[PDB]
Amino acid sequence: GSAMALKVGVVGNPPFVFYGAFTGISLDVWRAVAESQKWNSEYVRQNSISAGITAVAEGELDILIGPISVTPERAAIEGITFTQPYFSSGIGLLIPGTATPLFRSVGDLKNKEVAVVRDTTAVDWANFYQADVRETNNLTAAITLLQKKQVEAVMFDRPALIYYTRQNPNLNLEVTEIRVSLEPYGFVLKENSPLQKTINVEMLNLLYSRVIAEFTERWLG
Amino acid sequence: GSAMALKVGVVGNPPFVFYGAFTGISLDVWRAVAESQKWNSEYVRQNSISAGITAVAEGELDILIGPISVTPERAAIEGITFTQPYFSSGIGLLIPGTATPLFRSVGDLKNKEVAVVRDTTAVDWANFYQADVRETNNLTAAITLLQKKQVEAVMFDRPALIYYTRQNPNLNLEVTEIRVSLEPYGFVLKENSPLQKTINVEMLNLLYSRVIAEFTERWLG
Ligand SMILES: N[C@@H](CCC(=O)O)C(=O)O
Numbered sequence: 001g002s003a004m005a006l007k008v009g010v011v012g013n014p015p016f017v018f019y020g021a022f023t024g025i026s027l028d029v030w031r032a033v034a035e036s037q038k039w040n041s042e043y044v045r046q047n048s049i050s051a052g053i054t055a056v057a058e059g060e061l062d063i064l065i066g067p068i069s070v071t072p073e074r075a076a077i078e079g080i081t082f083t084q085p086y087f088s089s090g091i092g093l094l095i096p097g098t099a100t101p102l103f104r105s106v107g108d109l110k111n112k113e114v115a116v117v118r119d120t121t122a123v124d125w126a127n128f129y130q131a132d133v134r135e136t137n138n139l140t141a142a143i144t145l146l147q148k149k150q151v152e153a154v155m156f157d158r159p160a161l162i163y164y165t166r167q168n169p170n171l172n173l174e175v176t177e178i179r180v181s182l183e184p185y186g187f188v189l190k191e192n193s194p195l196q197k198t199i200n201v202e203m204l205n206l207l208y209s210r211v212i213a214e215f216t217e218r219w220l221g
Numbered sequence: 222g223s224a225m226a227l228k229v230g231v232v233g234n235p236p237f238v239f240y241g242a243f244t245g246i247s248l249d250v251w252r253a254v255a256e257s258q259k260w261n262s263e264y265v266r267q268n269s270i271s272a273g274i275t276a277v278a279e280g281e282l283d284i285l286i287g288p289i290s291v292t293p294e295r296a297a298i299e300g301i302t303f304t305q306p307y308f309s310s311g312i313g314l315l316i317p318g319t320a321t322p323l324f325r326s327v328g329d330l331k332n333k334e335v336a337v338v339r340d341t342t343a344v345d346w347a348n349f350y351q352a353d354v355r356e357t358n359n360l361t362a363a364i365t366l367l368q369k370k371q372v373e374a375v376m377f378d379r380p381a382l383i384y385y386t387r388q389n390p391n392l393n394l395e396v397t398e399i400r401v402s403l404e405p406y407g408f409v410l411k412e413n414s415p416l417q418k419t420i421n422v423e424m425l426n427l428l429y430s431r432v433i434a435e436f437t438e439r440w441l442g
């Protein structure tokens with residue numbers, strides 16, 4: 001097809017998004033949608049979810065894809081609308097194997113030095129649970145702070161934390177059973193976008209046919 | 222407030238919707254949204270989800286509330302759009318206590334006489350799993366068919382089935398551990414509705430603040 005390409009902003013971490021050029025669960029979901037419509041895409045990495053959402057509202061992007069948590073604050077941003085969610089995720093905690101007795105509930109987060117990645121929902125949850133929040137630029141940085149000793153835990157999306165531990169079994173880090181929150185992931189479109197219905201219908205088809213589950217199993221099963 | 226009332230279509234069964242005038246989890250969610258905006262409502266019972274969706278598309282209703290499963294086929298209906306989902310439900314099976322050994326998986330549904338309520342997602346799931354589908358007008362009718370012997374099971378939303386058994390412990394009916402599907406519940410608005418963002422933001426607030434969980438616990442905890 002020689003039709004104008006949709007400008008797709010990409011943000012997020014493994015296993016939902018990997019940067020080569022772009023792969024992961026979120027990319028698999030988007031590509032299945034685009035292919036079903038024979039649409040062309042032009043991918044543009046975004047610095048953060050906030051930057052990406054503004055780019056969609058300002059018309060610089062047609063859609064923002066990735067493991068984007070659907071939150072009240074984000075849904076309130078003028079000019080944008082979320083698609084139906086395609087994944088139900090949880091925000092968890094990564095800690096040293098020796099610290100497992102210390103982290104048994106969210107109440108245990110109070111006053112503990114917790115590392116979080118900037119512009120992620122974890123920043124707000126860590127503040128809400130009264131932790132000693134230490135913001136970092138990326139997950140690697142947050143985990144490097146855990147490997148040193150500045151922090152006692154890293155709060156971030158559970159699938160990303162589990163994926164990380166699986167690439168570094170040598171580290172002896174553990175993802176607690178604690179679920180700080182349950183959050184749905186969705187894509188972001190311009191409000192009243194003429195693409196909204198088509199995208200929702202296709203994402204729902206992928207969801208109900210268990211195709212999204214297959215994508216997830218390929219990266220985290 | 223003397224502002225024009227929003228026309229709210231109501232459809233569904235307990236514990237999400239009860240008909241006096243209207244109560245239940247779905248009504249609690251909607252009322253919390255309306256109250257936060259100081260909106261006036263005018264409730265109109267709908268015969269079915271399909272009828273209700275058409276009424277929203279045709280402008281007869283401003284919104285359709287209830288335990289409405291967000292499906293690809295419904296999302297594809299012209300002129301409407303679903304809100305963000307507010308509940309994650311499962312479609313289950315109600316069977317006699319003596320039949321528990323017979324229903325251990327969806328594969329066991331093949332050729333079994335299954336009762337379903339017309340215009341519910343269960344009709345499609347029962348057909349998909351190759352059951353001997355017997356459509357009925359309402360849940361009471363489907364269960365009355367189970368109490369007789371025309372059917373070997375009733376396929377319907379799990380929370381409604383559990384609620385039913387709890388009002389009739391004398392019956393000795395059991396809700397199997399089988400989950401035929403996992404489906405999100407949402408409300409239906411007119412496509413590009415000027416109410417969409419406000420409604421989504423409020424429903425998300427209720428969700429994240431655990432208020433929706435409190436509503437559910439009040440009727441099924
Ligand atoms: N789900 C997180 C982002 C997770 C990630 O960057 O992988 C958020 O929406 O803030």
Ligand SMILES: N[C@@H](CCC(=O)O)C(=O)O
Nearest residue numbers: 233234288289290341342
């Ligand atoms: N969730 C079902 C309806 C359940 C009910 O009527 O209570 C559907 O969307 O078909």
